Chains A and B, each alone.
Chain A
Amino acid sequence: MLTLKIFVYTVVTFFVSLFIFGFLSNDPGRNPGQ
């Protein structure tokens, strides 16, 4: 059961870190406006 908890924690933190550091990567500049 501890292995499942470790695996789920790893997956969740991976996806949340992806979300955070993707929205930190100059997101407002990705628009078609001139």
Chain B
Amino acid sequence: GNFTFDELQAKSYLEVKGSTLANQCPILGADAQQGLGDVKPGTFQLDKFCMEPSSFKVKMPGSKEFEPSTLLTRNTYSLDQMTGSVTVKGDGSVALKQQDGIDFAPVTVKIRGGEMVPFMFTVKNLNIEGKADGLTGDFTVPSYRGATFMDPQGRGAASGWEYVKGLAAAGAQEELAAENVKSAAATVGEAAFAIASTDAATGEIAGVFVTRQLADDDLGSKDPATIEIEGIWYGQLS
């Protein structure tokens, strides 16, 4: 980060263009009170909710420990401009729900062995609740590829060949029955958010997040891996 919302809005597009400052989340100023602060309990309209990751770890299927990864797709992995609702109770319990905005970004990373691991970084339909110390919830992870995506050989779920057109002699291809079927089914993930600062003067919040989800499976043709994503986040309450 190292820039606030006012500082970011004080620039020009020609000055931000190319500096990778558009892939980062703003931070709060010195006026921010620690933790929940002095926010009046109630339901607010969430806006400008963004999450900037700071580390990716991959646990390959068959391993019990996460591993570091190297990003391959440059600065395209920040979710931003999400909108929703935030409710604060008198005790201190907070509930966050995400409705719209850019809540998904495909990401590809490489691991120690040399295997690229695509995954679909998303917090779509986020539903978390708990104290300001930590909010535990879940989200839905849509398929990496759509239903109309066609593989190299022209096989897709809702459009494409249902078999291998190259091998004409093999009438049924019972050996290839596994790879001829495509399923773009969705899954779910888990999240653990926290709140570190709050400014009731302008209705701004910030904290950290840790999420766990699954990699892609090439439309049901692979065993997905588990990826842990951690970083910071920011949002505005109004």
- A/B touching: CB–CB < 8 A: no
